[PDB]
Write a protein that binds this ligand. Structure first.
Ligand SMILES: Nc1ncnc2c1ncn2[C@@H]1O[C@H](CSCC[C@H](N)C(=O)O)[C@@H](O)[C@H]1O
Ligand SMILES: Nc1ncnc2c1ncn2[C@@H]1O[C@H](CSCC[C@H](N)C(=O)O)[C@@H](O)[C@H]1O
Ligand SMILES: Cn1cnc2c1c(=O)[nH]c(=O)n2C
Ligand SMILES: Cn1cnc2c1c(=O)[nH]c(=O)n2C
Lengths: 348, 348
């Protein structure tokens, strides 16, 4: 998937929003960075070296950089490495850099050349940076993507991942894959961090106490509609497996403590409404448009993988079922994407 | 030009060749890198940090990385930053990285993750890297490009740059621009280098003793043909000025010594035949094809700037005149691109 997985190049950019997860991350990001400067890590007041792991493209890429930069300058050279898979749309980010830099100088006074933005492409499940070279690593909404479909060909009937309705051997196969992946992530990136360096990670979580469908759940139920309706053969659904896990906070916690590289400074979950990134009639129109927006966001996350497995002909039917499902969920008051945020410091 | 200048995205890749300049650079590159390891710069045996300034795209980008990597490993983590202007075709380099990395491991044994290739886009006339962070900076065939058209609207009649036929106020305007630009280059990048760090630079030079037309000279004479022939109004030629200088070695030497940041370790010129990158009938066919190749290479360097000034309609006529001119030059035995190579060490 290293050379297959990426967000939609409509686009992830057009459908993304600061208002979904990044605004919840921001205060925690801010506190993390301020604590780092106060900790006086070697060279941090000369050059603050930061990586954004799974930056994608679009406004969110720039919004995350802005948040970092403003956090650092809140009342040092900044070297930012943007990381994503080798077929991410880097060219478009780089073309927006000249205006980004000017706007940075008009906004903050940050002289041009004092914030140095480059890219380091590759999988965050492999080494990206020299040993003990980085102060801070940030990733938002990436770590639920696995390095591969769980290494357990086997039939996950009526399901596309370890959903609540999936059988326990599937659930165990997906957990074991996440464990491998996340342990590797932690082992590798701890080595890249300067002593007492930090990571701030935000990704999908599963909460036993709630019952809120995540984007994969909305997708799964919508593919199911289509087989029931007759539009898709049951074999297409039975063969489709997404390389994505939704962990519990206890699972996240056990993995980190097992790895041993990091102390947990902060660990919380939060629930983001589906349409938090949506802006504005009767009211059936209002809710139609909100549901249609949700479906666009969900299509923008999964289209590459959906097109390779199913072909392009079912995607408009799929978008239609996702919207219908989205609206029913929001009406029941369970229309939230559940997310965990965890702040880690490298142990001496 | 920071946001306008770039090589042709036919393409610079298809028309480029290791055999033109890089094979001449290679032995000097090799000696430079070996001397660096022996000098024991801080951290160099942990992580060797290298920048390629004006990497472009195509085989040459990868050939330069390969040469660096093989030089380092000749009987350490390697972090390579590829730099070019913000609208360079980075996406295509990154997409070739997965196979590059595998081929690196099949060739050398270089484990994956021990050579870390990223990008730092921007003008090399501004800061690219944190202070005292780099061991070695390499640039081949870039530094003759100026930051702007010489800051001397004024009419350069019948000429496109400071050619031998250009009047002395033009020559002085172009030299003064190169002086500003190259001095800035040196001041800025010296600051980025770790103590006793080095630069290896290769670019076009002008030699009083020879009389060999460079690619701009071939272009200039070919645009002149077209005005004489009637295909182009003299005003189009009189208004066209390329942001490019061809310095003498004495001019290069004076600038470096004036700047004061660098000691010169090595300084030589070499003359590269026009068709050194060309592979294979009577013989008028052979020489036709060799001349046509030269014209393609010349079009691939200048098409973006030619299209913006002249429009697209004259380019096939232009390619035809460049080939005719190329063949006459080669036949006289003066068909060489004259180049200088200079090795610099940061003074204590
Ligand atoms: N192993 C991996 N290495 C690098 N990037 C990965 C990855 N697995 C998933 N991703 C990236 O994770 C991103 C998820 S979308 C999140 C993007 C950004 N952090 C934001 O807030 O909008 C995608 O761009 C995808 O390509
Ligand atoms: N100010 C500048 N900053 C960064 N790159 C520049 C530049 N001025 C010119 N260049 C780059 O110089 C390159 C010249 S072609 C040389 C490319 C490569 N070194 C090789 O051996 O093939 C172009 O890609 C162009 O975009
Ligand atoms: C709702 N939403 C918004 N962005 C995302 C999601 C998601 O569910 N998974 C996911 O991977 N990403 C990037
Ligand atoms: C002959 N040749 C091959 N490559 C180049 C040239 C040149 O003349 N200028 C120039 O800038 N570049 C990149």
């Amino acid at each position: 998937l290293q050379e297959v997985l990426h967000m939609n190049g409509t686009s992830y950019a057009k459908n993304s929003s600061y208002n979904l997860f990044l605004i919840r991350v921001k205060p925690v990001l801010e506190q993390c960075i301020q604590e780092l400067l106060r900790a006086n890590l070697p060279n941090i007041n000369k050059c603050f070296k930061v990586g954004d792991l799974g930056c994608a493209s679009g406004p969110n890429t720039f919004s995350t950089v802005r948040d970092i930069v403003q956090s650092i300058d809140k009342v040092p050279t900044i070297q930012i490495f943007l990381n994503d898979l080798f077929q991410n749309d880097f060219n478009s980010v780089f073309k927006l850099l000249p205006s980004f830099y000017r706007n940075l100088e008009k906004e903050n006074g940050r002289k041009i050349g004092s914030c140095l933005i480059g890219a380091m492409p590759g999988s965050f499940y492999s080494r990206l940076f020299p040993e003990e070279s980085m102060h801070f690593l940030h990733s938002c909404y990436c770590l639920h993507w696995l390095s591969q479909v769980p290494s357990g060909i086997s039939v996950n009937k009526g399901c596309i991942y370890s959903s609540k309705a999936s059988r326990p051997p599937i659930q165990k196969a997906y957990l074991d894959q996440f464990t491998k992946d996340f342990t590797t992530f932690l082992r590798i990136h701890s080595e890249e961090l300067i002593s007492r360096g930090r990571m701030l990670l935000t990704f999908i979580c599963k909460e036993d106490e709630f019952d809120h469908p995540n984007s994969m759940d909305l997708l799964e139920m919508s593919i199911n509609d289509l087989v029931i309706e007759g539009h898709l053969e049951e074999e297409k659904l039975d063969s489709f497996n997404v390389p994505i896990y939704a962990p519990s906070t206890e699972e996240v916690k056990r993995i980190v403590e097992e790895e041993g590289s990091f102390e947990i400074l902060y660990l919380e979950t939060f629930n983001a409404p589906y349409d938090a990134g949506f802006s504005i009639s009767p009211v059936s129109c209002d809710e139609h448009a909100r549901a249609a927006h949700v479906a666009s966001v969900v299509r923008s996350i999964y289209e590459p993988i959906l097109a390779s497995h199913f072909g392009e002909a079912i995607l408009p039917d799929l978008s239609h079922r996702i919207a219908k499902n989205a609206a029913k969920v929001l009406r029941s008051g369970k229309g939230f994407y559940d997310s965990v945020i965890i702040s880690l410091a490298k142990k001496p």
